[model samples]
Target: GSSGSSGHQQQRSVMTEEYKVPDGMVGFIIGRGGEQISRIQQESGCKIQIAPDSGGLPERSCMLTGTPESVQSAKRLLDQIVEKGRSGPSSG
Candidate 1:
């Protein structure tokens, strides 16, 4: 059936990629009670879903899902966050 076939194909196309952020920085990325996460989604036009904490891993991670452009943008933003976090305060 078209419905079943298309649904399966669509599911395959919806690729989910994960990015890990440091443990201390997760709260900042998520903002105060998730305001930051919401802002990223609003500004970047991407859907980001953070995974629940598991095991003893101190790093927090998120899954980005969307078209290739959207996913690439999300990864770029995620990279920026990691770079800034590691670099401390500095003049632009």
Candidate 2:
């Protein structure tokens, strides 16, 4: 008798890296009309989303998710952006 069940599904896993952007810098990361955000996604081949807003929390974490390759890509790019905002424009 054949067991009536769906075939083995693909092994898919989602990973999230959580971190915060400095105050008033969300727009910069987000960029105008989401241009910057989209650029990040495209450049890294990752999906990103803004986490819930804060009641003035010291650190507001954003959410990042992607495949193994994509996550590393995103992390690299984001690190530069994060540092720039925190310490004020690391490089031109």
lDDT of 2 by residue, 5-57 (tens): 77873436778877566646665777888788788889988887776575577
* Poorest lDDT segment (10 consecutive residues) of candidate 2: 82-91
Error of 1 at 2 (Å): 46
- Best by the lDDT measure: 2
Cα-based TM-score, every candidate: 0.67, 0.65
The sequence of per-residue lDDT tens digits that candidate 1 reaches over residues 16-89 is: 77777776766677878888777777666678888667357887777787766677786677666667777757
- lDDT agreement with native, every candidate: 0.71, 0.72
Cα lDDT for residue 32, candidate 1: 85
Candidate RMSDs in order: 8.7, 9.4
Return the lDDT, model 2, position 66: 69
